[PDB]
Design a binder for this molecule. Structure first.
Ligand SMILES: Nc1nc2c(Cl)cccc2s1
Length: 167
């Protein structure tokens, strides 16, 4: 049993809810929250910008030190950093950004990072300002992630379309 409430069950291991991920993290304090990161961990807007704002910029400060030591992530890659006030850990995952011309086949590699964690609160990778089709992102998630994933969808309209169209 876990703390997640109000989710629709899509499969054995994938759950979905219309919820503001910043507000969901604050309520649940999950072991892992996933950030929709870029390779520079520059959390300016989107999921990254919203989560970073909720940490009072502490996520960005920590991220800048990580990049100064390690250099940029790979598209499809990830790193584990602090969850600050939102979670124990934040898994920063880089899905491909279609608005930069990145290979959408890298979306499966991105979701494979989730399999290193037994339970996660996450957004749909490469959705929103990363430009991918969220219906596609949900299909790749279901077909790739084997651990227990609780997906948060900000847009009520999109949430209802993801559920109604789910095979
Ligand atoms: N507070 C929140 N901001 C966002 C943004 Cl900017 C994108 C996607 C989901 C959420 S939840």
């Amino acid at each position: 049993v876990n703390s997640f409430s109000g989710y629709l069950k899509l499969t054995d291991n994938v759950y979905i809810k219309n919820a503001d991920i910043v507000e969901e993290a604050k309520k649940v304090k999950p072991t892992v929250v996933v950030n929709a990161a870029n390779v520079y961990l520059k959390h300016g807007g989107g999921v990254a910008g919203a989560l970073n704002k909720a940490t009072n910029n502490a996520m960005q400060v920590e991220s800048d030190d990580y990049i100064a030591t390690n250099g940029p992530l790979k598209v499809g890659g990830s790193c584990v950093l602090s969850g600050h006030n939102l979670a124990k850990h934040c898994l920063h995952v880089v899905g491909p950004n279609v608005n930069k011309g990145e290979d959408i086949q890298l979306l499966k590699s991105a979701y494979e990072n989730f399999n290193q964690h037994e339970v996660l609160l996450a957004p749909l990778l490469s959705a929103g300002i990363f430009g991918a089709d969220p219906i596609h992102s949900l299909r790749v998630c279901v077909d790739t992630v084997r651990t227990n994933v609780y997906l948060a969808v900000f847009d009520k309209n999109l949430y209802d379309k993801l559920v109604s169209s789910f095979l």
